[PDB]
Amino acid sequence: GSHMVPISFVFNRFPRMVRDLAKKMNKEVNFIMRGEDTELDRTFVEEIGEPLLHLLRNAIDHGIEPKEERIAKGKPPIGTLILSARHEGNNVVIEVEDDGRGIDKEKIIRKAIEKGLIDESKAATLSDQEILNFLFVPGFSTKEKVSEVSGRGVGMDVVKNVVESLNGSISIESEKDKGTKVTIRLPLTLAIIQALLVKVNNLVYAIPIANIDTILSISKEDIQRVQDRDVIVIRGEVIPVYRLWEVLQIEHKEELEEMEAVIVRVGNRKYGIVVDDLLGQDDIVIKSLGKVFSEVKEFSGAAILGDGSIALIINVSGIV
């Protein structure tokens, strides 16, 4: 739902960062951006960012060739950097293209062998592309780690990792003395779910609207404790309810006077989550939270609210 946003959002920091990375290398580059309005999911803008800059850099760093060496090969003095974006089916496509020293697949293969990763006869059944995919394989660029250790960034294996984490994918297309062109394709429609953002002590949690039966605004009294359980009654029907802080044992003031009770349904049974305040409805993208958390049932993933703060996503059936 209008989750998308023009790619301008990510592309405008560049025309300038490009202009500067040129000076810090004396290369003369005619940078071109085209499709600076191709809309891609609100999310991508924050992640897709560093990878593109990286690519952008390489071109200017390694790709584009210095004036001299450039006239020598009979190539106009002024190099060409192209940042483009477009839609091509069920995907968004972002490409960084240049006409520099190319990628010379021949030696990338050699390197690929000396690092005992590929057999020699086997390395013939390769297409120029996969040959280049090596360029991604971890530490396939020796370096040393340093620049990366904590400095000015280094590595594609990541750029791949990233676009792959976005359920996307990328390829390299290059020929020596004819520049290179990397191609990232990200999906055009995500696993968007609608949820009510709910608060509990400046901690934000999200409840799939797809389960919410109805929301009510109760008082710290309407919750009556039976033997063990805590329930509330609504026009008759007794509906069992759980106090979210307690369900997650969360250091909590105590409780205001006024609150909210989200009533959700799972299969044949229904109950309610009690919270401090409502925050609003929204469309969030469910992103899983590592293996360090697989075990946690209460949450079925997390999400990155616009402002950048995380909001754990409640698993109706996962709660007690």
Binding site: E144, K145, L203, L289, G290, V292, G308, I310
Partner: protein, 139 residues
């Protein structure tokens, strides 16, 4: 035969990981907590739009622990996993080597969690095994 390593502290207790995997070291800011979660993980942060788990090294090991001191997270990435270790502060990369590397790996209490204990200029630099300790957390 030459080592390079990222070294940090924990209430004056020095340690170190291999820069091989160290992704970066961000200054701890806000760490949204994940309720009813394995207490050795302090939670998750938002790094460049992706969700990263910040485990507490001091606690995972069982050593000098104090929170208002730990201001550095060491993000690291293995084959499929990514984690952030919270430590007091990072001194930085260090060049260690065979001669300096000592091995009484039966000396330190935490078993395989830490490779041998090496020293330099008379220090207690424990050489922890990331790829291993992380694997201790994932599984």
């Amino acid at each position: 035969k030459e080592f390079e390593v990222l070294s940090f502290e924990i209430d004056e207790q020095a340690l170190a990981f291999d820069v091989d995997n160290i992704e970066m070291v961000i200054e701890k800011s806000d760490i949204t907590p994940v309720p009813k979660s394995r207490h050795f993980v302090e939670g998750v942060i938002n790094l460049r739009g992706r969700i990263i788990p910040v485990v507490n090294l001091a606690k995972i090991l069982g050593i000098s622990f104090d929170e208002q001191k730990m201001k550095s997270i060491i993000v690291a990435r293995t084959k499929d996993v990514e984690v952030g270790f919270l430590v007091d502060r990072v001194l930085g990369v260090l060049r260690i080597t065979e001669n300096q590397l000592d091995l009484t790996n039966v000396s330190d209490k935490f078993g395989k969690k830490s490779k041998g204990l090496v020293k330099t200029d008379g220090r207690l630099i424990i050489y922890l095994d990331i790829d291993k300790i992380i694997e201790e957390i994932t599984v």
